[PDB]
Design an enzyme around this catalytic site. Structure first.
Site, mmCIF file in Angstrom:
data_model
loop_
_atom_site.group_PDB
_atom_site.id
_atom_site.type_symbol
_atom_site.label_atom_id
_atom_site.label_comp_id
_atom_site.label_asym_id
_atom_site.label_seq_id
_atom_site.Cartn_x
_atom_site.Cartn_y
_atom_site.Cartn_z
ATOM 1 N N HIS A 23 36.871 -45.052 -91.880
ATOM 2 C CA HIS A 23 35.726 -44.457 -92.586
ATOM 3 C C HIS A 23 35.964 -42.982 -92.872
ATOM 4 O O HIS A 23 36.829 -42.356 -92.269
ATOM 5 C CB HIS A 23 34.447 -44.611 -91.768
ATOM 6 C CG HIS A 23 34.476 -43.876 -90.460
ATOM 7 N ND1 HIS A 23 33.519 -42.951 -90.102
ATOM 8 C CD2 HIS A 23 35.356 -43.925 -89.433
ATOM 9 C CE1 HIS A 23 33.811 -42.460 -88.914
ATOM 10 N NE2 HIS A 23 34.916 -43.038 -88.483
ATOM 11 N N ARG A 74 29.377 -44.781 -87.605
ATOM 12 C CA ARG A 74 27.972 -44.561 -87.298
ATOM 13 C C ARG A 74 27.087 -45.721 -87.742
ATOM 14 O O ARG A 74 26.173 -46.091 -87.012
ATOM 15 C CB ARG A 74 27.508 -43.229 -87.891
ATOM 16 C CG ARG A 74 28.310 -42.038 -87.318
ATOM 17 C CD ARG A 74 27.784 -40.702 -87.810
ATOM 18 N NE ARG A 74 27.629 -40.715 -89.256
ATOM 19 C CZ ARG A 74 26.923 -39.825 -89.951
ATOM 20 N NH1 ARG A 74 26.297 -38.815 -89.348
ATOM 21 N NH2 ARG A 74 26.847 -39.949 -91.270
ATOM 22 N N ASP A 106 33.834 -43.437 -83.758
ATOM 23 C CA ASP A 106 32.936 -42.448 -84.438
ATOM 24 C C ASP A 106 32.208 -43.044 -85.606
ATOM 25 O O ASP A 106 31.411 -42.331 -86.193
ATOM 26 C CB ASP A 106 33.564 -41.197 -85.115
ATOM 27 C CG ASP A 106 34.878 -40.828 -84.637
ATOM 28 O OD1 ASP A 106 34.993 -40.248 -83.548
ATOM 29 O OD2 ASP A 106 35.810 -41.019 -85.428
ATOM 30 N N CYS A 138 36.143 -47.898 -85.886
ATOM 31 C CA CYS A 138 36.270 -46.651 -85.178
ATOM 32 C C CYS A 138 35.052 -46.346 -84.324
ATOM 33 O O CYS A 138 33.912 -46.558 -84.734
ATOM 34 C CB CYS A 138 36.484 -45.506 -86.158
ATOM 35 S SG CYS A 138 36.552 -43.906 -85.338
HETATM 36 ZN ZN LIG Z 1 36.100 -42.310 -86.927
#
Ligand SMILES: [Zn+2]
Ligand SMILES: [Zn+2]
Ligand SMILES: [Zn+2]
Ligand SMILES: [Zn+2]
Lengths: 209, 209, 207, 207
Positions: D84, D32, D30, D28
């Site tokens: 996640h 991190r 987003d 994804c």
């Molecule tokens: Zn995400």
């Protein structure tokens, strides 16, 4: 070849024998569909802005169809969008078959998802009539998909007049049949969609498993 | 509304007044295009498998159009694919304008790239005739795009019979005009494309800047 | 086999042994060192899209919707496109092989190659790929700056800056490719200056 | 401003202070912590696609062509989809807000939500997002296994295994979601078992 040459000759004969228009509807039909919408709807050329794809789909993330919808709504100020399915649909038949046909199967996976979404219904139906029901249900889901696009939701939100229609063309009588989903707002979309699915779900007793 | 109701009535009158087919061509036309290909080519319903999109494009990575080409070639064994542009094309006009029209502009950026690719030619032309030339050149580039797809290259490589055509429909006389790119192989595609561009590049002296 | 079982081991051991994003990073799927390590940034600073040859295709719903979300929703003010050297996608696009579906994705790179064919045709064959990699980055920043999303953000006065760099494995340094836009005018100017500069060849590069 | 100038500094300092890929990783945007750190793998082991909410959409040319290239060309035998926790895309898809273009991308997540609406409707509101995140991963492995690309690789006898995990920031551990396919039959079986298992709620999760 012989076929391209006959096409050019047919075009010429037609043109010789024959001897600005605001579009008011966006028409989303199927690449198989055999009778053209202008013939079928007997309207004057240029009244329809037309997109055709396999199995008349509005896929959430299809840039081709989405951009046509945005252009029709935001730029051409077209107030009516019509999804038209049709009987004996090759696309739908293609979607139901087991065969891996290659790249096209990825496109038809969205129809297969619509199959499983309504599997209980389609599974209480005798196998031989499922393709007719799926063609109907698919039109209803595509209108629903259309009414859920950012483009359509925003148009309605800013007070733009816009209606969505979902019909099926039956070649066996030449009639257009309303599948019952007809939206002028997010609320009418929801009610109309749910009503239509419920109505479609009442099965004819003689083909219930 | 009044318009949807007149459509249903027109469909009914048409159907009452009137009272299996292997497709042999894939037709890729434009959503604006006003006269339908079946009328234009005066062929029998079902001869054409049809995709329409804005400005009749074959974009390298357009899953909609690519999947239609793969289905036509690999599954339906269609031997002829035709890209048909047309005069007074809204899409092309839309592509040339300065306006940000929103999502559709991203779709028309491929036409703008075709503009800059032939900018020297189009720039030696008086501004008022550029939209006619760009419509022609666009058909030629889309055939070229089509002949460069993995689908078409593979079909030719395995000895499948397949020809690609690029025409423009002129409503002012009803004739189909061959733009000169016609491919049956990667080699014929290359020569034919280069020849056509070179031919199109010879400008009429009375509008040369 | 062991492979996947090994990853869970390496992960469990890693975890046992062991934020508003401010940049959208568009890099390449064949990139090998992560942008976060590369840039030594705090985790969550970067919102990341990776695809084959770090492309912004006009009509790619995947990358466009990433851009729109970064810009209109996350309010990110920097979009960084990063190419890299020894790029497998760039080399794949330059080869003559039918690789299947991926070849259609890579045709956009081949169009760019054609667009700069004169520049590229005067380069040493062993240098051409690294030049196309650099030109690619410039062309993608240009594509990004031409999206309705970015143009509309500028029109309405939103602070947004576009960047185009190349990461070199050899020495580990990002090198700026010179196309830097804060507006449509600065996009045009810097794109044209970037390419004009790339067209000045050093004799080491010249065939 | 300083921001970009700082990155070049942090990078120059990083570089001054400082391979066949065997997995395709679909994570994804987003996310991190990078997959490479997460898994403690050698650089170049992973071929990476990241998009919003780690999706394999049936008709996404971007992700499909990545898959095809990984499978038919790079000959990779493992495709890992990683979701996640605290996923911004998942939370964005669950909100009722018109975010613009991105909402169309996120409608596929909303379809999945509807598909498992009964399971989800009996969960605590503060737990639903983390459940949808898990279900999402299962559904995407399923989508991946249903592509013409993957099915055709299996048909022809090519070794290929699909995986669906969730990375938890809280404790740093990957947790396997149970859909693991080496064939179409094993896809179906493990998908159905995964969801059936997710449908067994602990009373801590139950509303
Ligand atoms: Zn995400
Ligand atoms: Zn059909
Ligand atoms: Zn047109
Ligand atoms: Zn690369």
């Amino acid at each position: 070849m012989d076929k391209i040459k006959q096409l050019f000759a047919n075009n010429y004969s037609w043109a010789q024998r024959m001897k600005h228009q605001t579009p008011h509807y966006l028409w989303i039909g199927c690449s198989d569909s055999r009778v053209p919408a202008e013939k079928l709807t007997n309207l004057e050329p240029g009244e329809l802005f037309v997109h055709r794809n396999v199995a008349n789909q509005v896929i959430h993330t299809d840039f081709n169809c989405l951009s046509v919808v945005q252009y029709a709504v935001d730029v051409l100020k077209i107030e009516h969008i019509i999804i038209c399915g049709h009987t004996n649909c090759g696309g739908i038949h293609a979607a139901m078959a087991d065969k891996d046909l290659g790249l096209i199967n990825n496109w038809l996976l969205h129809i297969r998802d619509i199959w499983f979404k309504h599997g209980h219904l389609l599974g209480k139906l005798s196998p031989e009539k499922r393709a007719d029901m799926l063609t109907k249900i698919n039109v209803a889901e595509q209108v629903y998909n259309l009414g859920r696009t950012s483009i359509v939701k925003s148009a309605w939100e800013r007070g733009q007049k816009l209606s969505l229609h979902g019909w099926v063309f039956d070649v066996n009588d030449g009639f257009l049949v309303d599948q019952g989903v007809m939206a002028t707002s997010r609320e009418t979309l929801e009610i109309s969609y749910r009503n239509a699915i419920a109505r479609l779900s009442i099965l004819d007793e003689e083909n219930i498993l």
